[PDB]
RNA sequence: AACGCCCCGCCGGCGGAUGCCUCGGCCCGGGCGGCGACGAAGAGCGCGGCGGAGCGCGAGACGCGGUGCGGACCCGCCCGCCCCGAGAAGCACCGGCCCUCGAACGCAGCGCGCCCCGGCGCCGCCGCCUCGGUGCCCUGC
């Protein structure tokens with residue numbers, strides 16, 4: 382189920398399936414964390430948790446507002462999604478543990494080298510409308526996978 | 535610029551086409567041609583060691599008995615059987631049990647009577663018992 386393959390063979394990996402969090406917010410968080418060192422990534426996520434840093438939105442941004450914390454990132458939009466941050470922190474911790482124990486590597490040389498977020502099937506509820514009509518009220522879950530390795534280049 | 539968007543070369547999702555397969559359908563031929571007041575068809579409610587639906591069965595209830603054949607298992611856990619008959623699974627025929635409604639029969643539908651002994655519905659045919667008539671007669675008075 383992993384979309385990432387290579388001969389590096391010194392990579393830690395983790396994944397979760399059917400995560401009950403918004404797919405778009407999680408995609409943005411994972412794209413934001415990519416290319417960072419693991420320690421910096423943990424610091425950044427914790428900072429996002431209390432509105433010290435922001436998550437820039439590059440893909441799903443139609444209603445996202447402009448904020449000054451996004452200055453200097455390539456876009457003027459961003460938000461502070463918390464459910465996504467909690468989930469991504471869990472998965473990253475698991476991947477780091479898998480890399481350190483399997484290959485005995487230390488945490489100061491590990492980077493976030495790959496990610497992938499895919500849409501999943503959600504639970505269906507219903508809502509009631511005027512003149513005796515019924516509509517749908519579904520959710521938008523996702524599958525997440527994170528890879529940690531030595532260095533991009 | 536970069537992003538976003540749109541187009542190639544690999545890898546993942548979402549969805550369920552296609553192909554192959556089917557103890558099912560549809561047509562044609564043959565046989566049969568058999569229900570019921572001795573309570574039918576149908577409905578309700580119950581019945582299993584652990585038991586919801588369906589099948590089956592009826593307070594003898596997930597079955598009882600008889601006569602033949604059969605010959606080692608019994609879908610789970612248990613219990614049981616094991617044998618030159620000592621008898622698990624299966625099969626055929628026969629005898630019984632057979633709650634409440636229903637043509638539905640003491641009234642009524644969940645309540646209540648009559649009766650003296652136990653039993654108490656309607657219509658018809660035959661027969662018997664007990665009777666009525668200023669019907670046709672007769673006798674006695």
Ligand SMILES: [Mg+2]
Pocket residue numbers: 443
């Ligand atoms: Mg708009």
Ligand SMILES: [Mg+2]
Pocket residue numbers: 508509510511
């Ligand atoms: Mg409404």
Ligand SMILES: [Mg+2]
Pocket residue numbers: 512513
């Ligand atoms: Mg209405």
Ligand SMILES: [Mg+2]
Pocket residue numbers: 587
């Ligand atoms: Mg049942």
Ligand SMILES: [Mg+2]
Pocket residue numbers: none
């Ligand atoms: Mg009756």
Ligand SMILES: [Mg+2]
Pocket residue numbers: none
């Ligand atoms: Mg009656």
